[PDB]
C-alpha atoms as one frame of an Amber mdcrd trajectory, in Angstrom:
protein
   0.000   0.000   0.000   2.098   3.181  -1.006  -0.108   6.735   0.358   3.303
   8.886   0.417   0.558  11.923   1.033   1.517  13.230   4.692   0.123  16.799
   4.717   2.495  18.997   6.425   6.095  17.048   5.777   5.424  14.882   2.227
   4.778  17.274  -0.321   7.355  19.641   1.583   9.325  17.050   1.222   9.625
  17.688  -3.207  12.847  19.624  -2.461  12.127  21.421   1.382  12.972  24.869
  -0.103  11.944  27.737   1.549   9.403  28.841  -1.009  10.571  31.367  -4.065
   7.988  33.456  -6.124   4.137  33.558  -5.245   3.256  34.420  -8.915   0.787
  38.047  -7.814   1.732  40.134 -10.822   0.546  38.754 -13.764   1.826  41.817
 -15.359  -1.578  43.454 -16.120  -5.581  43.141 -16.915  -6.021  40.195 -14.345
  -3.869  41.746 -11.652  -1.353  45.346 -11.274  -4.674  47.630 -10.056  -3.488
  51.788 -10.236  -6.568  54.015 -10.487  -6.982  56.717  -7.859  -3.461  55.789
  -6.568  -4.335  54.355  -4.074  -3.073  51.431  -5.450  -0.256  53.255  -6.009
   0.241  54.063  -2.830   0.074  50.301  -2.144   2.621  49.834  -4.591   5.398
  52.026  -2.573   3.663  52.457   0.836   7.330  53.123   2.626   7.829  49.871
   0.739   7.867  47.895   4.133   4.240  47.154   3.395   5.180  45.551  -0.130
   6.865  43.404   2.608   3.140  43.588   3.903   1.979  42.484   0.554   4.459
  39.757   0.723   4.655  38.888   4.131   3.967  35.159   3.512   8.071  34.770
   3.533   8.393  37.131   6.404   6.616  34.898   8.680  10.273  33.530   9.027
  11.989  36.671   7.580  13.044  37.446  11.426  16.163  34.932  11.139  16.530
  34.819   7.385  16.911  38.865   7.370  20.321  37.845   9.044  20.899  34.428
   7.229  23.835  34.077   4.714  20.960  35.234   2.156  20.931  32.719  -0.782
  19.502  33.296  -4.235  16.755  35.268  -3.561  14.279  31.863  -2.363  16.307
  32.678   1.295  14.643  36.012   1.367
């Protein structure tokens, strides 16, 4: 009976990277919003919110922000 499918540890287990790019661009029409700029705003708000709109990696960023800082996946 082979159910390799452990949630949690298995499928991290295809390489155990530390993530690399979320893919929330597009580059236009179904995403990259700028009307009133607003969305503007969003898109330089002191820049530590684009860490905001990225935070997913920063839940970890704490340690990694003084890592050795690999290719860009290390954050």
């Amino acid at each position: 009976l082979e159910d390799r499918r452990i949630p949690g540890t298995a499928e991290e287990n295809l390489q155990k990277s530390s993530g690399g790019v979320p893919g929330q661009n597009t580059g236009g029409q179904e995403a990259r919003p700028n009307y009133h700029c607003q969305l503007c705003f969003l898109r330089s708000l002191g820049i530590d919110y684009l860490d905001a709109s990225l935070r997913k990696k920063n839940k970890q960023r704490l340690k990694a922000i003084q890592q050795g800082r690999q290719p860009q996946y290390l954050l």
